[PDB]
Design a protein around this ligand. Structure first.
Ligand code: PLM
Ligand code: PLM
Ligand code: PLM
Ligand code: IPD
Ligand code: TDA
Ligand code: DKA
Ligand code: DKA
Ligand code: OCA
Ligand code: SHV
Ligand code: MG
Length: 279
């Protein structure tokens, strides 16, 4: 059948200069960490120690600076436009926030994205955005984000926005979280572990099983963080849509192998990241 489109997601892309670095190695997507200040305002694109093996953990920008850089990379006609960069996953580090600030955090995020990424609707960046939340109890962040876009007069930008709960929770628990949030599509399901530690495929298989069942809730599945060819082949054999990596060129090389070229292709802007793939 048709080739499954694959998102090769550059991991921990937190300095503006790293956008080109990862995209030029073959990434069509990037993942970026978002720290929050004491008021639930996004503050930095900062991961900090501990981080993935072989990586500098401390590259960062003021969050709005990174957003303007991301906008340049994703706005057709810009000197720095990268046609290939089509999805951004914001890893919202909401661990520093009280649970009752989750909604506020969503609103502040929407304000920053609207102002600095989507440029108030004036020739904004075109990439699809996944809001990745590490704690199921922070689901009210989603409603906050939405409600803020709506108040600012850009509710249509939600068409470009999707969702992830990244905490490796039980899949049934994740589904219940979405049910509470009233979310019924644009769902990516992360599964993984730092590149420093070994992991099996049981939960990723279960996420794929949910995605491909008639009444499942997951649209796309991604595995993280994968820096090895063997692991890449395993994840692709398992049927994942996305692979998050410190080395996009490693993933690219595997996808360019004759056997894999026949079953997979690098996703482009016209592949809707919210739509479950069918052969
Ligand atoms: C919107 C200004 C961002 C800077 C925040 C500094 C003061 C903290 C605000 C408390 C959060 C209440 C949620 C408001 C959402 C909003 O309208 O920004
Ligand atoms: C290959 C034997 C098992 C892997 C050992 C765990 C290693 C931690 C993750 C980093 C592995 C990536 C391999 C080198 C990356 C590269 O291609 O430059
Ligand atoms: C982009 C070319 C696709 C069609 C190629 C037919 C399959 C043969 C591929 C053999 C592996 C060579 C890897 C080259 C990857 C590339 O740059 O396209
Ligand atoms: O893999 P994922 O669940 O999307 O989120 C990632 C992991 O949770 C881990 O914290 C890491 O290295 C990156 O900072 C995050 O992207
Ligand atoms: C109703 C019992 C909750 C089932 C588990 C839901 C998963 C996370 C949701 C946290 C919010 C708790 C609540 O108000 O339901
Ligand atoms: C829970 C976040 C962990 C990020 C990955 C850090 C790698 C392991 C470091 C350690 O030994 O502690
Ligand atoms: C939190 C739900 C976000 C999805 C936004 C798209 C549809 C919203 C329906 C509505 O207008 O209320
Ligand atoms: C480099 C791969 C070339 C295709 C050979 C086998 C084609 C097939 O699947 O029928
Ligand atoms: C497609 C609907 C997504 C949210 C519902 C999650 C579930 O199936 O329990
Ligand atoms: Mg991260």
């Amino acid at each position: 059948g048709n080739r499954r489109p694959i998102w090769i997601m550059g991991h921990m892309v937190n300095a503006i200069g790293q956008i080109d670095e990862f995209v030029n190695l073959g990434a069509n997507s990037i993942e970026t960490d978002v720290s929050f200040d004491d008021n639930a305002n996004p503050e930095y694109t900062y991961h900090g120690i501990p981080c993935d093996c072989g990586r500098n953990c401390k590259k960062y920008e003021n969050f709005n600076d990174f957003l303007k850089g991301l906008r340049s990379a994703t706005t057709p006609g810009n000197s720095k436009y990268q046609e290939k960069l089509v999805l951004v996953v914001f890893d919202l580090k909401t661990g520093s926030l009280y649970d009752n600030q989750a909604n506020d955090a969503g609103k502040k995020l929407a304000k920053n994205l609207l102002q600095h990424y989507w440029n108030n609707g004036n020739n904004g960046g075109r990439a699809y955005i996944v809001l990745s939340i590490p704690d199921l109890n922070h689901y009210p962040l989603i409603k906050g984000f939405k409600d803020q876009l709506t108040k600012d007069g850009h509710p249509e930008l939600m068409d470009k926005v999707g969702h992830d709960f990244s905490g490796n929770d039980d899949i049934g628990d994740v589904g219940k979280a979405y049910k509470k949030a009233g979310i019924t599509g644009h769902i990516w399901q992360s599964d993984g572990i730092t590149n420093c530690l070994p992991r099996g495929l049981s939960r990723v298989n279960a996420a794929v099983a949910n995605r491909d069942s008639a009444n499942g809730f997951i649209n796309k599945v991604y595995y993280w963080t994968v820096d090895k060819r063997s692991t890449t082949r395993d994840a692709l054999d398992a049927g994942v849509d996305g692979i998050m990596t410190n080395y996009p060129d490693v993933i690219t090389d595997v996808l360019n192998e004759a056997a894999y070229k026949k079953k997979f292709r690098v996703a482009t802007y016209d592949d809707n990241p919210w739509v479950t793939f069918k052969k």
